[model samples]
Target: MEELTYRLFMVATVGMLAGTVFLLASSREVKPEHRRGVYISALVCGIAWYHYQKMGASWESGSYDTGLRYVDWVLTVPLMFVEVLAVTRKGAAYNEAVRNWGIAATVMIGAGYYGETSAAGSNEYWTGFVIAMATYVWLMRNLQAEGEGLKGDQAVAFENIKNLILVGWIIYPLGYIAPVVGDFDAIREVLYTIADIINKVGLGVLVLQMARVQSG
Candidate 1:
């Protein structure tokens, strides 16, 4: 299972890297907001990969994990904030709120890590997930409503990408819920694996679809 998970992660990472390269190469054609989104996605993935790698190393070395999971958790802060800012009208206000919330979440997760309290970590995870989902949904709705004014093939492509992101986010909360019900460890591991796979596939499809639009 460990080997399979590692291999799966490697494949996903490679694919994301390829997509990032394509987006960067076509940077001139990409909208600023979309570019920011792509960048944040890549950043979050990189941080998560690093955190997981560290955790695996710690386990193998018989060293304390020291809650490197908080590193990954904190990455969601900027990611959610950026997503909200990318599509919102009152972006400054939204950004401020996200930042404040992120600070609180970070502190909570950090305390949990040091105190060896699973509940603290769980609270942080759920809080971050909720914020991220809410922001992504808002962004999707905003884009969908705003895209109605656009004409031609661009409009259709934009709408398609918007719906894909919206639907993807709708599934995200379910992914979170599954872990909350069963044997916590087993359920969390399985649900997170599935969620990550879904997220990568969904985001990849949306990015490719947006590439077709050649707009935002």
Candidate 2:
């Protein structure tokens, strides 16, 4: 499992880096707002890769690996907010939906992290799952609202990126929920594995897609 996880992480990291390069190249031709989004995506990709590497190292150390976990959570909390800011600043009506859902999801994840740090049960994680679900529902709604009337290749790229992120966001909650509905330890093991897979793969795809966008 550890080896598999590491391999997956590497694949995702490569994808993210490749995407970043593409986005940087495109930025010279796209609008500033679009360019900024790609830059932020690159930042996110780098952070994700760093955390992934940390997780792998921790696993190899034969000790509890909370460092990478904490790093992932901390970075993600800000990222959720950043994404909301990026999407909503354009005066999209869906901004409110994104804000509400993002806040809930971040809080849920934060609560779960706290619980884990304190050695609490999986109940907190379940709350996070609920919030995650709410987030995805809102995210989809926001995407639908924004996707309407979109034209050209830019629109297609944006929509595809949005969908990729949505898919990744949704997977996490299911993985978390699975552990709660079944055997605790077993579920955690499975969920963590799945989470790692989705995160590395999903983010990698997102980064790569963002890079493909043309920057003015």
Candidate 3:
């Protein structure tokens, strides 16, 4: 289990680095209209790359930095929504959506972090968990509604990303409460690593691909 955890974190760290570099370079070549998504995607992975490096090292040394993990999410998750908004929306609509999504992302991550850091099975834990989950549901639902109107490669990309959130992002809340759910900390670690790789890097690649295609 230890070996697997180490390797998974290593994989996640490398994935973030690659995603950051690829998206950053792609941002330079994309059209101005599409540059926002590409650049934001690059920034998301770049931030994740730093956190993953620290997280991987800390975990390998026989200590896990749970706070660091939430710190990463608090930064990256909102930027991710920003990337999606930049890719799929326009003008005033995009501006308004970005603001709403930003607030939702903040509430989601912040509440989850509060619960996660509190005593498991306690009132504080349940309250934060419930609030976070509710916010997450609301955020995902609205994001999907906005993407329903997209067409072409943009539509395809947005759909793929929405699936990532619907499927991949759910792993987080489950993992957060895994202690009370069962004695599965080790297993949740693995799931968290995999989900991070899939969602974060996956988001960066899909957004980059959308921008590239649109630019061409």
Q: Scored by CA lDDT, what does every candidate get?
A: 0.51, 0.54, 0.84
Full-model lDDT, candidate 3? 0.84
Compared with the true structure, what per-residue lDDT tens digits does model 1 show for residues 125-209? 6665556555545545554675666577756665655665566545434544554665444344434444554554445445545
For every candidate in turn, the CA RMSD to the true structure comes to: 6.0, 4.6, 1.7
Per-residue accuracy of model 2 over 1-216 as CA lDDT, tens digit each: 555655655665566556556545655554665455556555665666676666656656766444346567656645644543453345664466456656655665665555444323366545644555565566567556655665677577667656655665565555445544565543454445456545544553454454345442
Query: By the lDDT metric, which is better: model 1 or model 3?
Result: 3
The C-alpha stretches of model 3 lying farther than 4 A from their native spots are: none
Clashes of each: 0, 7, 0
Model 1 lDDT, residue 94, Cα = 61
Worst 10 residues of 3 by lDDT: 59-68
Candidate 3 residues 47-93, lDDT tens each?
88898889887886768856668889998999999998887888898
What is the Å distance of residue 43 in model 1 from its true position? 3.4
lDDT of 2 at 103: 68
Say which prediction, candidate 1 or candidate 2, comes out ahead on TM-score: 2
